[PDB]
């Protein structure tokens, strides 16, 4: 711990004299709170140099399809192979070797909600929040594993939920008020994501939010790795004997939590890291793509921008009807705990694996002239973010896997408030109900009046066990 003077001197030496412009006019308590905040910034001099340089760089690659040996598709695999992977996955779950890391983010502000995003109700007939839907998915897969192994008690899948600092209390309160949706209170473990200072447009100065406080912001989903180390989560995976991790984002209302087929794929192929993708059908779709970087022969994720319209439109040589680069990233990963133990210390210590991504933003803060707070109408600074997928190139190519899945069954994200064309509570609700209805019709059920039904996870995790609906008629809104 450093004293008031040592803290002040370290920021002044790092050319941040503007942070103390009003320091002497503050009360002693205001000063002490400010020093405490500044003390939380790890190696500030190093941070500032990295940012300014990163901003300069932000103002000719060779990409191709991943090698066939590293890919697979649930749309192509035989039912027997899918069942074998499911069994490998249920076996791991049944032996307590599987845990889930959830990136829950912050408030559902963009959706028009002040509550944590996981609390959002897309208005299914059941009115269940995203958190409850995912909690029931976990309970059901624990049940399917128990049945497969014929165990006396159901196995436990620990669910580690990373919240932003501001939503930690409301998130934990929501779970407690609902008695953990039926899960054991000990298997839901909360931990907060870290933050980084916000900077001016050039990236050479940290911004003051108030006369005695700097602007800070969540450090991107790539901040997960450092949060796992610092909050003792990696320690806990080891103490609990966990071997396999399924990681995803709370906003996917269709997510197959702890999917045994995905875990089994990784076990069968002995992968250190794997990812799920869905087919990109329109060369115009705005989504990240998983590709092979031919220059370093490593797997990686590229944004729509980094590809030429030509390559984006290029068709596959072995099937002109499909796009050449069609592996759309749905932020759904597998990691082996052995790989995490080995790589986390490396990843969090260098820009090589987790480079800062820069975002120009309108940041409410002190006006650089008068020193009074204000809400800008044009970008006046930048926010930093690390991306979860930037660690992909560090994996050995033959230890990386990419599983293509069916979008209609596995991915429908909640991103925009109702009114937009895509990714709204309405599209999520309709995709969820259409998936449920499809499952029912596939099993011989019939839905009257052009309606839709909802399938409860306690009845079916992903379409199995619905043989009993054969010949039965359902009404719009029925829950099965």
Residues 63 to 92: which contact Mg ion by CB under 5 A? Answer: 68, 71
Write the binding mask 318 to 347 for Mg ion: x where contact by CB under 5 A, - elsewhere: ------------------------------
398 is in an annotated binding site: no
Closer residue to Mg ion, CB minimum distance, 37 or 71: 71
220 is in an annotated binding site: yes
258 is in an annotated binding site: no
Nearest-approach distance from CB 241 to Mg ion, in angstroms: 32
Residue 384 per-residue DSSP state: E
- By CB under 5 A, tell whether 309 contacts Mg ion: no
**Alpha-carbon distances, residue 361 vs 13, 111, 198, 374, 434 (angstroms):** 27, 19, 10, 14, 38
Nearest-approach distance from CB 144 to Mg ion, in angstroms: 27
| Three-state DSSP state, 48 | helix
**Alpha-carbon distances, residue 420 vs 286, 328, 415, 426, 427 (angstroms):** 15, 21, 10, 9, 9
Closer residue to Mg ion, CB minimum distance, 257 or 402: 402
105 is in an annotated binding site: yes
Closer residue to Mg ion, CB minimum distance, 71 or 84: 71
Closer residue to Mg ion, CB minimum distance, 265 or 335: 265
Residues 413 to 432: which contact Mg ion by CB under 5 A? Answer: none
Residues 148 to 177: which contact Mg ion by CB under 5 A? Answer: none
Closer residue to Mg ion, CB minimum distance, 70 or 427: 70
Closer residue to Mg ion, CB minimum distance, 71 or 476: 71
Residues 13 to 72: which contact Mg ion by CB under 5 A? Answer: 68, 71
- The residue whose two tokens read 């087919």 is 279
Name the pairing type of β-strands 289-293 and 63-64. antiparallel
Name the pairing type of β-strands 298-302 and 289-293. antiparallel
Rounded CA separation 237/243 (Å): 8
104 is in an annotated binding site: yes
Rounded CA separation 200/88 (Å): 51
103 is in an annotated binding site: yes
Rounded CA separation 227/178 (Å): 26
Evaluate whether 214 touches 302 at the Cβ level (below 8 Å).
no
Nearest-approach distance from CB 330 to Mg ion, in angstroms: 18
314 is in an annotated binding site: no
Nearest-approach distance from CB 282 to Mg ion, in angstroms: 23
Evaluate whether 402 touches 66 at the Cβ level (below 8 Å).
yes
415 is in an annotated binding site: yes
Rounded CA separation 386/389 (Å): 9
Closer residue to Mg ion, CB minimum distance, 81 or 441: 81
Nearest-approach distance from CB 310 to Mg ion, in angstroms: 25
Rounded CA separation 86/276 (Å): 16
Nearest-approach distance from CB 67 to Mg ion, in angstroms: 8
| Three-state DSSP state, 204 | coil
193 is in an annotated binding site: yes
Which residue has the closest beta carbon to Mg ion? 71
Nearest-approach distance from CB 404 to Mg ion, in angstroms: 9
Closer residue to Mg ion, CB minimum distance, 30 or 71: 71
Evaluate whether 208 touches 23 at the Cβ level (below 8 Å).
no
- The residue whose two tokens read 């039912």 is 79
Please, which residues have CB within 8 angstroms of residue 460's CB and are 6 or more apart in sequence? 140, 439, 466, 480
By rule CB under 5 A, what count of residues binds Mg ion? 2
Please, which residues have CB within 8 angstroms of residue 77's CB and are 6 or more apart in sequence? none
Nearest-approach distance from CB 307 to Mg ion, in angstroms: 22
Which residues belong to the annotated binding site for substrate? 221, 415
Which residues belong to the annotated binding site for UTP? 103-106, 117, 193, 220, 251, 383
Instruction: Give the binding site for Mg ion (CB under 5 A).
Output: 68, 71
Which residues belong to the annotated binding site? 103-106, 117, 193, 220-221, 251, 383, 415
């Amino acid at each position: 711990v450093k004293s008031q003077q040592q803290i002040i001197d370290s920021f002044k030496q790092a050319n941040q004299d503007q942070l103390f412009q009003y320091y002497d006019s503050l009360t002693i308590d205001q000063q002490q709170e400010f020093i405490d905040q500044l003390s939380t910034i790890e190696e500030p001099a190093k941070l500032i140099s990295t940012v300014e340089q990163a901003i300069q760089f932000s103002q000719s690659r060779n990409f191709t399809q991943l090698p066939n040996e590293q890919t697979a598709s649930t749309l192509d695999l035989s039912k027997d192979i899918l069942q074998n992977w499911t069994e490998l996955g249920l076996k791991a779950i049944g032996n307590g070797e599987v845990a889930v890391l959830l990136m829950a983010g912050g408030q559902g502000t963009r959706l028009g909600s002040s509550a944590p995003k996981g609390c959002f109700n897309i208005e299914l007939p059941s009115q269940k929040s995203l958190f409850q839907i995912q909690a029931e998915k976990i309970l059901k897969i624990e049940q399917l594993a128990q049945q497969y192994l014929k165990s006396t008690k159901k196995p436990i899948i620990n669910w580690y939920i990373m919240t932003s600092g501001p939503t930690r209390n409301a998130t934990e309160s929501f779970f407690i008020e609902n008695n953990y949706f039926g899960l054991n209170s000990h298997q839901v473990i909360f931990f907060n994501q870290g933050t980084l200072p916000c900077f001016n447009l050039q990236g050479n100065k940290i911004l003051l939010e108030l006369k005695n406080s700097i602007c800070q912001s969540p450090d991107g989903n790539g901040g997960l790795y450092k949060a796992l180390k610092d909050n003792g989560i990696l320690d806990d995976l080891n103490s609990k004997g966990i071997k396999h991790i399924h990681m995803y984002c709370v906003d996917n209302c269709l997510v197959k939590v702890a999917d045994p087929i995905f875990i089994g794929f990784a076990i069968a192929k002995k992968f250190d890291l794997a990812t799920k993708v869905v087919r990109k059908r329109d060369a115009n779709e705005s989504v990240g793509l998983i590709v092979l970087d031919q220059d370093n022969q490593k797997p990686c994720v590229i944004e729509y921008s980094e590809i030429s319209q030509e390559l984006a439109n290029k068709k596959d040589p072995q099937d002109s009807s499909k796009l050449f680069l069609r592996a759309a990233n749905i932020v759904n990963h597998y990691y082996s705990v052995e790989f995490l133990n080995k790589m986390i210390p490396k990843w969090i210590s260098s820009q090589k694996y987790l480079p800062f991504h820069i975002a120009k933003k309108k940041i409410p803060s002190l006006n650089l002239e008068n020193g009074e707070f204000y809400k800008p109408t044009e970008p006046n600074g930048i926010k930093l973010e690390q991306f979860i997928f930037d660690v992909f190139p560090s994996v050995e190519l033959n230890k990386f896997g990419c599983l293509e899945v069916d979008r209609l069954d596995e991915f429908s994200p909640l991103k925009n408030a109702d009114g937009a064309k895509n990714d709204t509570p309405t599209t999520c609700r309709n995709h969820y109900l259409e998936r449920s209805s499809k499952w029912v019709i596939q099993n011989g059920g019939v839905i009257d009046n052009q309606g839709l039904v909802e399938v409860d996870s306690k009845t079916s995790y992903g379409g199995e066990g619905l043989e009993f609906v054969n010949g039965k008629h359902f009404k719009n809104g029925d829950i099965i």
